[PDB]
Amino acid sequence: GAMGSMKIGIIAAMEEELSLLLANLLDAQEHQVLSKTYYTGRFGKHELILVQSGVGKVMSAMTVAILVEHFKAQAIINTGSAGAVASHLAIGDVVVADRLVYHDVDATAFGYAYGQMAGQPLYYDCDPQFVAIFKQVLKHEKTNGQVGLIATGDSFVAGQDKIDQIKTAFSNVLAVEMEGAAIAQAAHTAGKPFIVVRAMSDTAAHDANITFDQFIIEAGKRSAQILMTFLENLPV
Amino acid sequence: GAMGSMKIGIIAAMEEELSLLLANLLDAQEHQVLSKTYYTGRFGKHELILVQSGVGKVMSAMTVAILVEHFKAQAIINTGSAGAVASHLAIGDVVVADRLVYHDVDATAFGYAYGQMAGQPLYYDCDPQFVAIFKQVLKHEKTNGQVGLIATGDSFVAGQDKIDQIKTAFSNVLAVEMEGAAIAQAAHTAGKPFIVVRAMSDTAAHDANITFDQFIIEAGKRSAQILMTFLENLPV
Numbered sequence: 001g002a003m004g005s006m007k008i009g010i011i012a013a014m015e016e017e018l019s020l021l022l023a024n025l026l027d028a029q030e031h032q033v034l035s036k037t038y039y040t041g042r043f044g045k046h047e048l049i050l051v052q053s054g055v056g057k058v059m060s061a062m063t064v065a066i067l068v069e070h071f072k073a074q075a076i077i078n079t080g081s082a083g084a085v086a087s088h089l090a091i092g093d094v095v096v097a098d099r100l101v102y103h104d105v106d107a108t109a110f111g112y113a114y115g116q117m118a119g120q121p122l123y124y125d126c127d128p129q130f131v132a133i134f135k136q137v138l139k140h141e142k143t144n145g146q147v148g149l150i151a152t153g154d155s156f157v158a159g160q161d162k163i164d165q166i167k168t169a170f171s172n173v174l175a176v177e178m179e180g181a182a183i184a185q186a187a188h189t190a191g192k193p194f195i196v197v198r199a200m201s202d203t204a205a206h207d208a209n210i211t212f213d214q215f216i217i218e219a220g221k222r223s224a225q226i227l228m229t230f231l232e233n234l235p236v
Numbered sequence: 237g238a239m240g241s242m243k244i245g246i247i248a249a250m251e252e253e254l255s256l257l258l259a260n261l262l263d264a265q266e267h268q269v270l271s272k273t274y275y276t277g278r279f280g281k282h283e284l285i286l287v288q289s290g291v292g293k294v295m296s297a298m299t300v301a302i303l304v305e306h307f308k309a310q311a312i313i314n315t316g317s318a319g320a321v322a323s324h325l326a327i328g329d330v331v332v333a334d335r336l337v338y339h340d341v342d343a344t345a346f347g348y349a350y351g352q353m354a355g356q357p358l359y360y361d362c363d364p365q366f367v368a369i370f371k372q373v374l375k376h377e378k379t380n381g382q383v384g385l386i387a388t389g390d391s392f393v394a395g396q397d398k399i400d401q402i403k404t405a406f407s408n409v410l411a412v413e414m415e416g417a418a419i420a421q422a423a424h425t426a427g428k429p430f431i432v433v434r435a436m437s438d439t440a441a442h443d444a445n446i447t448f449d450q451f452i453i454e455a456g457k458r459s460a461q462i463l464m465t466f467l468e469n470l471p472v
């Protein structure tokens with residue numbers, strides 16, 4: 001592209017988390033690759049490749065490999081919903097991850113840290129460039145958006161017992177979801193900068209499915225709006 | 237004749253199996269993609285792509301995505317070793333999985349069965365021809381083995397109480413390991429037939445007096461030999 005324009009891959013697990021970004025994409029074109037639809041186009045000064053990956057670690061990690069190998073993405077961003085687990089964090093609030101960790105990985109029998117996949121770091125560090133820009137977006141909005149740790153696992157967290165297990169393991173976790181550390185692990189192995197941004201759909205309580213169904217449209221929308229302000233502020 | 241020469245991706249976890257397969261490839265070429273090493277060449281009537289397996293769900297999902305998109309694999313074979321969890325299996329027996337399931341996935345709040353990923357079946361199905369052909373190789377070579385279920389999660393499960401929990405949840409499980417169902421979920425998403433096979437490194441009672449890393453030296457060679465027979469018996 002011109003100057004420092006980037007090709008940015010953006011992954012949302014579900015339709016509600018990608019619809020608004022698609023409504024913003026200029027010069028859009030669909031592509032079918034490994035049975036998923038990728039949408040190329042422009043936003044602000046950058047080129048995006050959007051995809052609805054499907055939920056969880058395997059689906060999201062496949063889309064990072066194809067975004068980098070096939071679409072030549074230079075950065076990877078995940079957006080969508082999450083369950084709020086920290087104190088002082090409500091439904092509709094935004095968390096931008098500065099680090100990702102798995103809460104459901106136990107290879108401690110091979111002498112790894114709890115949460116650490118073999119052959120990987122325990123924490124995946126979001127790009128510090130992107131964190132600083134998103135930190136300034138949240139600041140300018142002047143509400144309750146936070147930057148901190150998001151934890152991932154292949155489970156939808158719904159109950160105090162699994163909140164307590166996660167916070168015992170990682171006391172500073174803000175929110176939980178099913179793709180952020182998977183996308184971070186994949187983009188880290190590919191050598192490309194990444195970040196995760198989420199808006200809270202629920203508080204991961206025993207009946208969190210009912211709350212998620214109420215708020216998933218809003219959570220997808222809110223995460224996407226913050227992401228677009230970041231893209232407007234990412235220079236070239 | 238039918239589909240002709242099949243491009244087959246082989247994800248081999250045992251380094252002595254991968255070295256023996258590579259030693260048999262015609263026109264062997266080395267390739268780096270997303271920082272990982274793949275070998276392409278021919279064996280018998282087929283073109284192969286060989287790669288060392290990574291560990292866990294995310295590295296498995298990237299490997300299948302790259303084998304299919306970059307190298308145009310039309311089928312995925314994943315081999316390795318794992319301890320038995322069913323009582324009747326002996327050290328060195330070969331489990332040919334016909335189904336894979338996750339033991340560590342909980343989206344039950346939404347009404348899914350335990351183990352079932354959102355948007356997926358609870359069990360993934362290995363290709364029925366590949367399962368029959370492998371079972372026949374074992375029979376022809378008078379090598380003991382069994383067809384059945386393998387359960388996967390992003391943990392190494394060392395505690396027997398946790399093993400018994402997985403057996404309570406999935407009654408017919410023969411063995412538990414860290415990549416098979418992610419290979420299955422990724423290859424199925426891609427629309428490619430696949431199969432997962434494991435040599436049993438230990439019995440359910442832990443009778444082995446050789447370690448896993450020692451077991452896989454000679455087992456990797458045995459598994460390479462069985463695989464090359466399977467590839468000779470895969471029709472064009």
Ligand SMILES: CSC[C@H]1O[C@@H](n2cnc3c(N)ncnc32)[C@H](O)[C@@H]1O
Pocket residue numbers: 013014054055056080081082083084155156157158176177178179201202203204208212343346354
């Ligand atoms: C339908 S499975 C839940 C989907 O929404 C996100 N998510 C939203 N709230 C939660 C929660 N409480 N626990 C886990 N993942 C969540 C996940 O990353 C996944 O894509």
